[PDB]
Design an enzyme around this catalytic site. Structure first.
Site, PDB file in Angstrom:
ATOM      1  N   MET A  26       2.263  -2.930  11.466  1.00 14.54           N
ATOM      2  CA  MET A  26       1.748  -1.362  11.472  1.00 14.54           C
ATOM      3  C   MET A  26       1.424  -1.261   9.877  1.00 14.54           C
ATOM      4  O   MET A  26       2.163  -0.429   9.057  1.00 14.54           O
ATOM      5  CB  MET A  26       2.508  -0.172  12.007  1.00 14.54           C
ATOM      6  CG  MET A  26       3.419  -0.508  13.198  1.00 14.54           C
ATOM      7  SD  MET A  26       4.562   0.758  13.607  1.00 14.54           S
ATOM      8  CE  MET A  26       3.318   2.226  13.887  1.00 14.54           C
ATOM      9  N   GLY A  27       0.353  -1.940   9.397  1.00 15.19           N
ATOM     10  CA  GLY A  27      -0.095  -1.934   8.079  1.00 15.19           C
ATOM     11  C   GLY A  27       0.845  -2.750   7.291  1.00 15.19           C
ATOM     12  O   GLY A  27       2.221  -2.802   7.463  1.00 15.19           O
ATOM     13  N   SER A  28       0.588  -3.199   5.768  1.00 11.64           N
ATOM     14  CA  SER A  28       1.348  -3.667   4.847  1.00 11.64           C
ATOM     15  C   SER A  28       2.266  -2.676   4.456  1.00 11.64           C
ATOM     16  O   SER A  28       2.091  -1.822   3.611  1.00 11.64           O
ATOM     17  CB  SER A  28       0.370  -4.401   3.725  1.00 11.64           C
ATOM     18  OG  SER A  28       1.381  -4.747   2.739  1.00 11.64           O
ATOM     19  N   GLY A  29       3.610  -2.909   4.649  1.00 14.01           N
ATOM     20  CA  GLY A  29       4.571  -2.059   4.288  1.00 14.01           C
ATOM     21  C   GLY A  29       4.892  -2.143   2.883  1.00 14.01           C
ATOM     22  O   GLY A  29       4.925  -3.180   2.255  1.00 14.01           O
ATOM     23  N   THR A  30       5.083  -1.071   2.179  1.00 12.02           N
ATOM     24  CA  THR A  30       5.539  -0.948   0.808  1.00 12.02           C
ATOM     25  C   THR A  30       7.125  -0.734   0.624  1.00 12.02           C
ATOM     26  O   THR A  30       7.453  -0.855  -0.524  1.00 12.02           O
ATOM     27  CB  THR A  30       4.926   0.135   0.002  1.00 12.02           C
ATOM     28  OG1 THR A  30       5.018   1.417   0.498  1.00 12.02           O
ATOM     29  CG2 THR A  30       3.509   0.181   0.292  1.00 12.02           C
ATOM     30  N   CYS A  31       7.846  -0.444   1.708  1.00 14.26           N
ATOM     31  CA  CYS A  31       9.170  -0.375   1.630  1.00 14.26           C
ATOM     32  C   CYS A  31       9.771  -1.045   2.815  1.00 14.26           C
ATOM     33  O   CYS A  31      10.778  -0.755   3.759  1.00 14.26           O
ATOM     34  CB  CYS A  31       9.764   0.905   1.782  1.00 14.26           C
ATOM     35  SG  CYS A  31      11.595   0.962   1.499  1.00 14.26           S
ATOM     36  N   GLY A  32       9.132  -2.541   3.086  1.00 14.79           N
ATOM     37  CA  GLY A  32       9.509  -3.461   4.206  1.00 14.79           C
ATOM     38  C   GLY A  32       8.490  -3.603   5.285  1.00 14.79           C
ATOM     39  O   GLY A  32       7.495  -2.694   5.501  1.00 14.79           O
ATOM     40  N   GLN A  33       8.435  -4.793   5.703  1.00 16.38           N
ATOM     41  CA  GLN A  33       7.538  -5.021   6.578  1.00 16.38           C
ATOM     42  C   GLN A  33       8.059  -4.453   7.851  1.00 16.38           C
ATOM     43  O   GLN A  33       9.031  -4.380   8.471  1.00 16.38           O
ATOM     44  CB  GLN A  33       7.506  -6.580   7.100  1.00 16.38           C
ATOM     45  CG  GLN A  33       6.358  -7.087   7.972  1.00 16.38           C
ATOM     46  CD  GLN A  33       6.232  -8.400   8.093  1.00 16.38           C
ATOM     47  OE1 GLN A  33       7.187  -9.354   8.437  1.00 16.38           O
ATOM     48  NE2 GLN A  33       4.965  -9.190   7.587  1.00 16.38           N
ATOM     49  N   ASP A 143       9.382  10.761  -4.673  1.00 13.87           N
ATOM     50  CA  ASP A 143       8.068  10.346  -4.560  1.00 13.87           C
ATOM     51  C   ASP A 143       7.511  10.786  -3.512  1.00 13.87           C
ATOM     52  O   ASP A 143       7.044  10.096  -2.502  1.00 13.87           O
ATOM     53  CB  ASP A 143       8.206   8.716  -4.367  1.00 13.87           C
ATOM     54  CG  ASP A 143       6.979   7.935  -4.731  1.00 13.87           C
ATOM     55  OD1 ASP A 143       5.963   8.577  -5.296  1.00 13.87           O
ATOM     56  OD2 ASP A 143       6.966   6.675  -4.421  1.00 13.87           O
TER      57      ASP A 143
HETATM   58  C1  LIG Z   1       0.407   5.572   5.956  1.00 17.13           C
HETATM   59  C2  LIG Z   1       1.075   5.100   6.710  1.00 17.13           C
HETATM   60  C3  LIG Z   1       1.512   3.819   6.205  1.00 17.13           C
HETATM   61  O1  LIG Z   1       0.790   3.245   5.172  1.00 17.13           O
HETATM   62  N1  LIG Z   1       2.790   2.984   6.244  1.00 17.13           N
HETATM   63  C4  LIG Z   1       3.063   2.072   5.497  1.00 17.13           C
HETATM   64  C5  LIG Z   1       3.688   0.922   6.461  1.00 17.13           C
HETATM   65  C6  LIG Z   1       4.838   1.379   7.233  1.00 17.13           C
HETATM   66  C7  LIG Z   1       4.583   2.543   8.227  1.00 17.13           C
HETATM   67  N2  LIG Z   1       5.593   3.118   8.917  1.00 17.13           N
HETATM   68  N3  LIG Z   1       6.595   3.257   8.282  1.00 17.13           N
HETATM   69  C8  LIG Z   1       7.465   3.768   9.118  1.00 17.13           C
HETATM   70  C9  LIG Z   1       8.846   3.959   9.039  1.00 17.13           C
HETATM   71  C10 LIG Z   1      10.042   4.200   8.698  1.00 17.13           C
HETATM   72  C11 LIG Z   1       7.050   4.031  10.226  1.00 17.13           C
HETATM   73  C12 LIG Z   1       7.121   4.642  11.448  1.00 17.13           C
HETATM   74  N4  LIG Z   1       8.469   5.014  11.453  1.00 17.13           N
HETATM   75  N5  LIG Z   1       6.287   5.028  12.513  1.00 17.13           N
HETATM   76  C13 LIG Z   1       4.980   4.502  12.291  1.00 17.13           C
HETATM   77  N6  LIG Z   1       4.617   3.917  11.071  1.00 17.13           N
HETATM   78  C14 LIG Z   1       5.340   3.769  10.111  1.00 17.13           C
HETATM   79  C15 LIG Z   1       3.695   3.737   7.272  1.00 17.13           C
END
Ligand SMILES: */C=C/C(=O)N1CCC[C@@H](n2nc(C#C)c3c(N)ncnc32)C1
EC number: 2.7.12.2
Length: 290
Positions: A26-33, A143
């Site tokens: 779900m998108g490139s994670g900035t605090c973990g994949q 942040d």
């Molecule tokens: C704007 C959304 C975004 O860019 N991201 C970055 C990648 C991770 C993504 N994501 N993180 C979490 C957590 C914890 C979730 C959850 N819980 N549900 C949907 N997407 C998430 C957010």
């Protein structure tokens, strides 16, 4: 704490990682994949963060730091709930409640301002989230920003990513007192810098545009924060008097004058959207479907 189980909605299975089907990231994670993953017994979908033992030592520290907070905040409704974790010889998997998307990506899809009624129910959630971590755990986010405000199909709005929380984030939302700390630095000079950040975000999501225009560098933004007037909401967009004065309170540059969460939660703009019904769930599905 333990790592065998998955406590969801009162139940608590005892599975491992291979009991989940990986439906993609779900998108490139900035605090973990982050993977969207689906159970093999039932078919229920969740979010699952992965920390590789081989990962960058600095990202991993933040992943564990965000994990430290969300394990302690189960009883807060306005923080992304964690379901459990798995520890393998090579990875750590963090199971999270599956959310829809961030408000920053929500803004890009809207292609315009986000309605005040939605920003209303957002404000109540973030402030109460920032207040819970302060009062119960003495933590500050450090942040806050639209990319850290998650919304879902059900109309939930929760804060996320405590990777640099503690007992420097993005510069554009950084509070005046964090940019130039006071002459003698009291330990809790920082205690309300998050309020200023949520005010910058409210102005951004309400107007569709970041309030400090045409900054080509990080420092250039920092100077506008300190030299220019606070960027209050405009008057020509039908924003209510409660919404504009709440944004004015948060955007008071002098931190010794910025109101504590104690009295921000007393604000009329908050009290309205506590008892007012707003179908953020339906509004969410529509923008997504667009
Ligand atoms: C704007 C959304 C975004 O860019 N991201 C970055 C990648 C991770 C993504 N994501 N993180 C979490 C957590 C914890 C979730 C959850 N819980 N549900 C949907 N997407 C998430 C957010």
């Amino acid at each position: 704490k333990q790592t065998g189980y998955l406590t969801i909605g009162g139940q608590r299975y005892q599975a491992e990682i291979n009991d989940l089907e990986n439906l993609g990231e779900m998108g490139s994670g900035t605090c973990g994949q982050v993977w969207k993953m689906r159970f093999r017994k039932t078919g229920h979908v969740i979010a699952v963060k992965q920390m590789r033992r081989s990962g960058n030592k600095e990202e991993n520290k933040r992943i564990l730091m965000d994990l430290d907070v969300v394990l302690k905040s189960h009883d807060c409704p306005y923080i992304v709930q964690c379901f459990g974790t798995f520890i393998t010889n090579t990875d750590v998997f963090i199971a999270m409640e599956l959310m829809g998307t961030c408000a920053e990506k929500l803004k890009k899809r809207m292609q315009g301002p986000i309605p005040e009624r939605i920003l209303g129910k957002m404000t109540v959630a973030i402030v109460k989230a920032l207040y819970y971590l302060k009062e119960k755990h003495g933590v500050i986010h450090r942040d806050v920003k639209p990319s850290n405000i998650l919304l879902d199909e059900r109309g939930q709005i929760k804060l996320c990513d405590f990777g640099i929380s503690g007992r420097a984030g993005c510069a554009a939302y950084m509070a005046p007192e964090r940019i130039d700390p006071p002459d003698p630095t009291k330990p809790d000079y920082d205690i309300r810098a998050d309020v200023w950040s949520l005010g910058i975000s409210l102005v951004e999501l309400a107007t569709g545009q970041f309030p400090y225009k045409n900054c080509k560098t990080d420092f250039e933004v920092l100077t506008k924060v300190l030299q220019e007037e606070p960027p209050l909401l405009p008057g020509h967009m039908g924003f209510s008097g409660d919404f504009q004065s709440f944004v004015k309170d948060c955007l008071t540059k002098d931190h010794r004058k910025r109101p504590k969460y104690n009295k921000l939660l007393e604000h009329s703009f908050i009290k309205r959207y506590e008892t007012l019904e707003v179908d953020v769930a339906s509004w969410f599905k529509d923008v997504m479907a667009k």
